[PDB]
Paper text:
The small GTPase RAS proteins operate as “molecular switches” that fluctuate between inactive and active states. These switches can be activated by the exchange of guanosine triphosphate (GTP) for guanosine diphosphate (GDP), which is promoted by guanine nucleotide exchange factors (GEFs). The H-REV107 gene is a known member of the class II tumor suppressor gene family that has been identified as a growth inhibitory RAS target capable of suppressing anchorage independent growth in vitro an in vivo. Here, we found direct interaction and inhibition between KRAS G12V and novel H-REV107 peptide.
For example, the most common KRAS mutation types are G12C, G12D, and G12V accounting for almost 83% of all KRAS mutations. The KRAS G12V (1–168)-MgGDP was obtained as a new monomeric crystal form that belongs to the hexagonal space group P63, with unit cell parameters a = b = 82.547, c = 40.804 Å, α = β = 90, and γ = 120°. The structure of KRAS G12V-MgGDP consists of five α-helices (α1–α5) and six β-strands (β1–β6). The folding type of KRAS G12V-MgGDP is an α/β doubly wound shape, which is a mostly parallel sheet with helices on both sides. The P-loop, and switch I and II regions in the structure are located in residues 10–17, 30–38, and 60–76, respectively. In this structure, KRAS G12V contains one molecule of MgGDP per asymmetric unit. Mg2+ bound to the OH groups of the S17 in the P-loop, T58 around switch II, and oxygen of the GDP β-phosphate. When the structures of our KRAS G12V and KRAS G12V-H-REV107 peptide were superimposed on Cα atoms, the root mean square deviation (RMSD) showed a difference value of 0.503 Å. The structural differences between the KRAS G12V and KRAS G12V-H-REV107 peptide are mainly in the switch I and II regions.
Residue numbers in the entry: 1 to 168
């Protein structure tokens, strides 16, 4: 009875809470308190198989809990999110990739790079840039929009699929 513990990381404002709520609840949140760091559960059929997704949506806050601990420790895969209209959130990606390696003492962590807000026309990080970054970490790269649902399931299920490869 497989449950996958997914962790969503990235700079503030990139859409980590919106992606999670799109996937779990199928609507787009226009605002969501940046300090709310919860987990969200759902049962989905991925590639024809049912599973339990436990998704911790991080909020980088000096307030405390065990879930943000009990999960960054043994979350099995991480979504690293930036926004395609937010160069600074792309420049921070390497900070978050390094954090994950430290918290799991491994450079073999299941991981997907997500470029969110692809519905927005004022783009400053282009697809090639992001692809090159992903190809240098060894990881898939997925373009999403929490507003339109584009790529949203694909981000999360590719990560689940990477966790599957890793188990072997
Ligand atoms: N246009 C557009 N806006 C988005 C998208 N995803 C998130 N947003 C908006 O970006 C802002 C920050 O989103 P949020 O989920 O709170 O980011 P977080 O800080 O990573 O949790 C919110 O106002 C969202 O409505 C998207 O795919 N497209
Ligand atoms: Mg948030």
């Amino acid at each position: 009875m497989t449950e996958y513990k997914l962790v969503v990381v990235g700079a503030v404002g990139v859409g980590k809470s919106a992606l999670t709520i799109q996937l779990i609840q199928n609507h787009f949140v226009d605002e969501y308190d940046p300090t709310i760091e919860d987990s969200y559960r759902k049962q989905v059929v991925i590639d024809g198989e049912t599973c339990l997704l436990d998704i911790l949506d991080t909020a980088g806050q000096e307030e405390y809990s065990a879930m943000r601990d009990q999960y960054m420790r043994t979350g099995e895969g991480f979504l690293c999110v930036f926004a395609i209209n937010n160069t600074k959130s792309f420049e921070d990606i390497h900070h978050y990739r390094e954090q994950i390696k430290r918290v799991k003492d491994s450079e073999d962590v299941p991981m997907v790079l997500v470029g969110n807000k692809c519905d927005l026309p004022s783009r400053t990080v282009d697809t090639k840039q992001a692809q090159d970054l992903a190809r240098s970490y060894g990881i898939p790269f997925i373009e999403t929009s929490a507003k339109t649902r584009q790529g949203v399931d694909d981000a999360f299920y590719t990560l689940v699929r990477e966790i599957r490869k890793h188990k072997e």
